[PDB]
Amino acid sequence: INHFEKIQIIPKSSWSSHEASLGVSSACPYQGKSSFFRNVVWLIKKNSTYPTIKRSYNNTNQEDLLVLWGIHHPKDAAEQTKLYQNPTTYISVGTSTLNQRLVPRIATRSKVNGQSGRMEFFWTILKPNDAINFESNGNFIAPEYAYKIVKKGDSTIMKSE
């Protein structure tokens, strides 16, 4: 791959049933304030409720699309209900080929960047005319931006200081 074209597939504003603007951490600082990975949305409960999410995006572009998403693994049972209410959650992802179902694993973990929680990130290539389908109870790190693959050719990742 020689060129990506970033596009928005699921707007940040369109999460009218969940809190999409409080998904930040001191582990990801920006100009002295708590921030987060800009291309994905850390969704949490709104007014003490996390209703089931059911979102679909259809690849209407000519280009193959690289889609990124994630799952949050919390520190303990208290933090789970604190962020998402529901004690047992999941994320199910489907495409033409893909048939995924993720569940958050809870455990006591060492503090990296002052966090005992973890983020596990996943990806897929959504081919043209195919649709990706999400469903979740919580712990969902939703895509906002995905990358179009516009130019394919000779390239390499070169390790150098």
Ligand X SMILES: *[C@@H]1O[C@H](CO)[C@@H](O[C@@H]2O[C@H](CO)[C@@H](O)[C@H](O)[C@H]2NC(C)=O)[C@H](O)[C@H]1NC(C)=O
Ligand Y SMILES: *[C@@H]1O[C@H](CO)[C@@H](O)[C@H](O)[C@H]1NC(C)=O
Footprint of ligand X (CB under 6 A):
58, 60, 129, 131
What's 24's DSSP letter?
-
Least distance to ligand Y, CB of residue 17, Å: 24
Number of residues that bind its own copies (CB under 8 A): 26
By CB under 6 A, name the one of 13, 31, 110, 160 that touches ligand Y.
110
Q: Is residue 113 at the binding interface for ligand Y, with CB under 6 A as the rule?
A: no
Least distance to its own copies, CB of residue 132, Å: 8
Residues with their C more than 2.5 Å from the N of the next written residue in the chain, i.e. before a break, are none
The answer to whether the CB of 136 falls within 8 A of the CB of 103 is no
Nearer to ligand Y, 26 or 129 (CB): 129
Least distance to ligand X, CB of residue 134, Å: 14
Question: Burial of 122 by CB count in 10 Å (0-12 exposed, 13-18 middle, 19+ buried)?
Answer: middle
